[PDB]
Design a protein around this nucleic acid. Structure first.
Lengths: 248, 159, 312, 117, 177, 60
RNA sequence: AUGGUGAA
RNA sequence: GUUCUUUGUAAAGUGCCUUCGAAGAGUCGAGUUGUUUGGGAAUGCAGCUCUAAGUGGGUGGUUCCAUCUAAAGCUAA
RNA sequence: GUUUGACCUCAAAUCAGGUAGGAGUACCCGCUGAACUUAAGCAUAUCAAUAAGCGGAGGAAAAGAAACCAACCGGGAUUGCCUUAGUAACGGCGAGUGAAGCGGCAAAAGCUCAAAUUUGAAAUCUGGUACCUUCGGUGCCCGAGUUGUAAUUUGGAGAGGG
């Protein structure tokens, strides 16, 4: 199908912001890690929280390992991601929009976290939001009858929990939630065990109300998510708990 | 057989130029009956207890537009082709050409109605503009004069 | 009698809204009772579906135009139809309501354990989980339990809400494979019917027998477990079932689901302490493990079947 | 002047109080519209109430386990020409209880009893 | 505004532009009924200068009449019988054929509350204006009655029957002249 | 008792039934009301205020 | 003559 | 007569000074066929053909001058 | 987008609100229109811009604020009466037909549109609905309406400002 000339320039000029955006960030945290401060913007780790009158509490980031749940968002408008962001989103396998994953935030994780900030939304979840996510959505890529494994289907059982993991004390689905809410050693194995979380999209349709509710909610993303595009851009945190009520 | 001043219409503005015209014109909506009323109640609640410049909008009455062209105050004038009495607007492209006000025949009368809080409009004009859209307006003037006027210089002829 | 093809032509509403209304009164073809449809045509809910349709034409001309400013106005100045005046025709006596609330919680406890889709709105779901924990708030408060039954399907319950043995199957807390066959248009309209029905009853059980409706919630207990220990409650025996676990402080552990099991002990009276709450005075710990580890003398180690044996 | 005259009239009306300002109308709608379904309302078909199960469960007496031939015979038979909606299984532990895969359908078929019957 | 341009455009009737509009409309009006309602007046400048406001209560009936008593008055009389609730205000020529002539007679609803209010048009609500066309009190009726001012209109100024009855009946006083 | 009950249920609302309205006559059920007849154009109201029909006497 | 009523 | 309220940088009027300042078309008119009159300068009207102008146009008076402004409408006694 | 959405037009309904018919008819307003009869037979003049018929109104109707009359040291909407007057004028100058301006009086009243932009804000109206002091007022919603509804102006000028 035919391409209008409006498109290919808008796609050009938006990605060639992002090709310029991550280049500067990739130069910066290089100079932050290699510690050659003669000319830098800022010398520490920034995490900002945006909640509600629309508070913007910017914080530092210590080395304390925390737990972040990250949802893939589809932004911005005309942005073919570059090679450097195809990778991180594929290594987190967040290549589908409206799909989530828990990861751990270290000082190894935070510099790569500034790469993918315009493409996802991040944040700290709560235990309810930890628990009510997993026991309501959960995929298990496991063997079918004999041949067809990749039926990812359902966290039906607690003995499939015995099957794959099992020997790490992994006995039930509630025990998995212990391994995620608390940083356990086998956290990455069970994180590799629950591969997506197919969240629903909020608007989910065309129609009378649906056109309007799309427009009314689309501007709400523009306030609750700002795209910093800075060298020392903060990482923006939203409340996951209010988001999962919109997504579960 | 059509006499040349009729079918000076139908040779209308094309796809992309018309889209860009509305990209400009939809910025300049008149404040609707509901919006105007709520603003004045805001003014009532504020000014009764405890400055603004002139706001630009499109001008849309046939008498108002025929005033503005020959005033001369109009910069761009959009003209619908489908009009129930065609004789209402047949003189209007000639008036614009005579006074040297840039005009464009747009396609669809209800298409003019959408940008203007009415059912139909037949004619719409943009007298003045905000400073940011000034260069964009003047560029569209040249775009319309190149596409509409220069291509159809022979529109005054040929039945 | 009249014909199914006749009544839609007769009522001149949507066929879905015929089916949507027909759930509301409770009209069933024996064929269509002709007086009853003539009885239906003078009813204020029929006012709204015509108005809800004529809202929709007036709105799509709005956004179709592109005046979103005017489009946004339509919603704020838009009513909702209530189903209060479908209830009092249908539930004359409140004790008749509690003999039909059997099916009501049997729907609504399902819906809390549902993923939000395009088909189902989460607001309904986040009400349903709220209404369930509103239901269990009163039940666990005044100890109103008689019998239990855990089975393959879900977990049945039994309680004398002023003596009628309600029975409501709580399903098991897992992802549920939503089948392609089912219809969440008919079922939701039941929930829509049942949800407002469940409001007044909980108002009735509070504001006439017990407490204020609804009590406030406690957010920070809801951050942990999001169940029955949250949603705190304020106002303003004869059975040994109600006398069970009287000052018997328990510990629950990570094997069982606490949510299905903290309910009963609080319905009896014992205190419930979980492993899951962080993320002594206790004298019981429920475990499902071939390898138990700690084994103190104070705690009494019973598999939870016996707790269900204590009830029946 | 026109708008200036029009304001002065709306000033006049709120001086006479015929009209409420829009900020208090939200306050008229804040007290209202939360107080919904929060009032007393009370102060013939028997609806065919469902059959009460007792002692057919996850941990039954295991003779209630279906014969292995009737397992497929229950499967090979189709729905509603059918005695059980399931086949019961045996679980010694509370933990081993599976995802009860067909509880959604059990209400959807029940729902059709509620109005079509 | 445009009404000066339309006023002058309607002068050149046999000119190329208006000639073409005639031959299209003459075909179109033959497709429709003898007496039917147009939603808007085709010559709106003429409608205004004969007293038409584009508000609720004003109606523009289009009417067809045969060629070779006056045709304008017959046109008004035909719509008077069909639209009896309305009151005929004025009529005007729009288009003609070899066989037929068309008029766009303008009407006012006296029953409609938008007319019973405003004082510029509430005079038509008064029962003295029932069927103005059936008494020759319209523009064309007053024209055919020969009612103007001058030496020309001496025998038919204030009723031609009235002046006849005055001149051909003897008048006698109490004390004879 | 029926008629007073109907008048009570149609208490001061626009367009109550034809069998309860005043008979009067036909012509008086047509013809402009007190308000409608006394309704004057905005210009004439200004000319009434600015130059009203004055009261005077003529001698001393 | 105008207008009407009847009629192998 | 007796009061209750009058508001908003509101609504006019008057004189001077300054800058502008659009008024009705298938109509007026023209020929003809009929009707109208006691109407001589077809008066008035209708039918049919063609159909204008803006320091304009209509009507009258011995070369000008006087007089009104059609083709829209309302109105008591 | 092989969807969908604007309008315009044509529909619809035992929906909501209305309205028109018919009777009366002396007067009034339109339309239509004879014959006996008069001058000599009858085409005009003459019965007659009648009677009958048709359509339409009201307490009156119609007419009416000049595209008027005049020829003067000008009058000044219309209607009626007195008079002009049986005059001018027409009429096989014959049956005869028959005004008008002026003057005296009765009664007196004038105004509204369309016309060039509210453009720093359709300032307007209908209807529904909720109340109120109900031949109506107000709030809210809906529709009409820019193919122009309000204010301002009608030649006596008028408008913009100072």
């Amino acid at each position: 199908k035919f391409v209008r000339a409006e498109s290919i320039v808008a796609k050009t000029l938006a990605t060639s912001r992002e090709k310029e955006r991550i280049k500067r960030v990739s130069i910066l945290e290089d100079k932050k890690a290699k510690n050659e401060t003669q000319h830098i913007a800022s010398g520490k780790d920034f995490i900002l929280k945006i909640t509600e009158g629309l508070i913007r509490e910017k914080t530092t980031y210590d080395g304390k390992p925390a737990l972040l749940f990250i949802v893939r968002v589809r932004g911005p408008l005309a942005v073919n991601i570059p090679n450097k962001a195809f990778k991180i989103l594929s290594l987190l396998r967040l290549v589908e929009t409206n799909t989530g994953v828990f990861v751990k935030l270290t000082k190894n994780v935070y510099p790569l976290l500034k790469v993918i900030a315009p493409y996802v939304v991040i944040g700290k979840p709560s235990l309810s939001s930890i628990r009510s996510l997993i026991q309501k959505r959960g995929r298990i890529i496991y063997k079918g009858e004999n041949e067809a494994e990749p039926h990812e289907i359902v966290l039906n059982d607690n003995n499939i929990v015995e099957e794959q993991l099992g020997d790490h004390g992994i006995i039930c689905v509630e025990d998995i939630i212990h391994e995620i809410a608390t940083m356990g050693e086998s956290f990455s194995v069970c994180n590799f065990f629950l591969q997506p979380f197919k969240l629903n999209r909020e608007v989910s349709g065309f129609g009378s109300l649906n056109r309007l509710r799309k427009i009314k909610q689309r501007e709400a993303e523009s306030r609750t998510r700002q795209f910093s595009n800075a060298a020392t851009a903060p990482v923006i945190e939203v409340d996951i708990d209010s988001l999962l009520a919109k997504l579960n | 057989k059509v006499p040349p001043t009729i079918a000076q219409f139908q040779y209308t503005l094309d796809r992309n130029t018309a889209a860009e015209t509305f990209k400009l014109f939809n910025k300049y909506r008149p404040e609707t009956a509901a919006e105007k009323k709520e603003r004045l109640t805001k003014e009532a609640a504020a000014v009764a207890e405890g400055a603004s410049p002139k706001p630009y909008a499109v001008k849309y009455g046939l008498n108002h537009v025929v005033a503005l062209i020959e005033n001369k105050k109009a910069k761009l004038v959009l003209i619908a082709n489908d009009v129930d009495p065609i004789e209402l607007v047949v003189f209007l492209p000639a008036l614009c050409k005579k006074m040297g006000v840039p005009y464009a025949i747009v396609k669809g009368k209800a298409r003019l109605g959408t940008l203007v809080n009415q059912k139909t409009s037949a004619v719409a004009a943009l007298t003045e503009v905000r400073a940011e859209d000034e260069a964009a307006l003047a560029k569209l003037v040249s775009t319309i004069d190149a596409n509409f006027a220069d291509k159809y210089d022979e529109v005054k002829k040929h039945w | 009698f009249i014909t199914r093809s006749q009544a839609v032509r007769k009522l001149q509403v949507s066929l879905a809204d015929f089916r949507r209304l027909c759930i509301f009164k409770g009209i069933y073809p024996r064929f269509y009772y002709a007086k009853d449809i003539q009885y239906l045509m003078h009813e204020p809910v029929l006012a709204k579906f015509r108005e809800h349709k004529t809202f929709a034409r007036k709105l799509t001309r709005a956004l179709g135009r592109g005046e979103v400013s005017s489009a946004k106005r339509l919603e704020e100045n838009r009513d909702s139809y209530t189903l209060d005046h479908i209830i009092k025709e249908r539930y004359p006596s409140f004790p008749d309501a509690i003999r039909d609330i059997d099916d009501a919680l049997n729907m609504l406890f399902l819906f809390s354990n549902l993923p939000s889709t395009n088909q189902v709105s989460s607001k309904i779901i986040n009400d349903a989980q709220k209404i369930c924990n509103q239901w269990l708030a009163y039940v666990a408060k005044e100890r109103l339990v008689r019998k239990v039954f855990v089975s393959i399907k879900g977990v049945y319950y039994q309680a004398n809400i002023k003596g009628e043995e309600v029975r409501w199957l709580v399903p098991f807390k897992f992802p549920e494979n939503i089948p392609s066959d089912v219809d969440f248009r008919i079922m939701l309209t039941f929930l829509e019917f049942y949800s407002t029905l469940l409001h007044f009853v909980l108002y009735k059980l509070y504001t006439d027998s017990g407490l204020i409706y609804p009590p406030k919630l406690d957010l920070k207990k809801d951050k942990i477990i999001s169940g029955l220990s949250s949603y705190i409650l304020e106002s303003r025996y004869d059975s040994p079932v109600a006398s069970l676990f009287s000052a018997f402080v328990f510990y629950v552990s990570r094997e069982v689901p606490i949510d299905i099991l903290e309910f009963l002990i609080l319905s009896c009276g014992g205190n419930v302490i979980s492993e899951a709450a962080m993320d002594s005075k206790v004298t019981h710990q429920i475990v499902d493990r071939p390898v138990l580890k700690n084994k103190v003398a104070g705690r009494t180690y019973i598999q939870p079947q016996w707790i269900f044996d204590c009830i029946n | 002047k026109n708008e200036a005259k029009r304001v002065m009239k709306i000033v006049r009306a709120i001086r006479e109080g015929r009209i409420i300002p829009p900020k208090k109308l939200k306050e008229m709608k804040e007290k209202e519209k939360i107080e919904n379904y929060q009032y007393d309302l009370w102060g013939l078909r028997a609806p065919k109430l469902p059959p009460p199960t007792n002692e057919e469960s996850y941990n039954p007496p295991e003779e209630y386990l279906l014969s292995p031939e009737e397992k497929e015979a229950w499967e090979n038979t189709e729905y509603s020409e059918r005695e059980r909606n399931f086949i019961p299984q045996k679980y010694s532990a509370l933990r081993k209880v599976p995802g009860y895969g067909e509880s959604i359908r059990e209400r959807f078929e029940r729902s059709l009893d509620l109005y079509l019957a | 505004g445009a009404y000066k341009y339309l006023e002058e455009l309607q002068r050149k009737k046999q000119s190329d532009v208006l000639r073409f509009l005639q031959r299209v409309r003459v075909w179109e009006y033959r497709q429709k009924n003898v007496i039917h309602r147009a939603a808007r007046p085709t010559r709106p400048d003429k409608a205004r200068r004969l007293g038409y406001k584009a508000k609720q209560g004003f109606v523009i009936y289009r009417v067809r009449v045969r060629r070779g008593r006056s045709l304008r008055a017959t046109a008004e009389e035909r719509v008077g019988r069909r639209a009896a609730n309305l009151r005929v205000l004025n009529s005007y020529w729009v288009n003609q054929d070899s066989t037929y002539k068309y008029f766009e007679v303008i009407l006012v609803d006296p029953q409609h509350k938008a007319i019973r209010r405003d004082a510029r048009y509430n005079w038509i609500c008064d029962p003295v204006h029932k069927h103005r066309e059936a008494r020759g009190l319209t523009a064309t009726g007053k024209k055919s009655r020969g009612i103007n001012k001058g030496h020309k209109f001496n025998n038919t100024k204030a009723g031609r029957r009235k002046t006849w009855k005055r001149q051909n009946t003897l008048s006698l006083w109490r004390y004879r002249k | 008792q029926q008629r007073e009950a109907v008048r009570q249920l149609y208490k001061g609302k626009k367009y109550q039934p034809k069998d309860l309205r005043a008979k009067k006559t036909r012509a008086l059920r047509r013809a402009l009301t007190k308000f409608e007849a006394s309704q004057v154009t905005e210009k004439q109201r200004k000319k009434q205020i600015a130059f009203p029909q004055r009261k005077y006497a003529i001698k001393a």
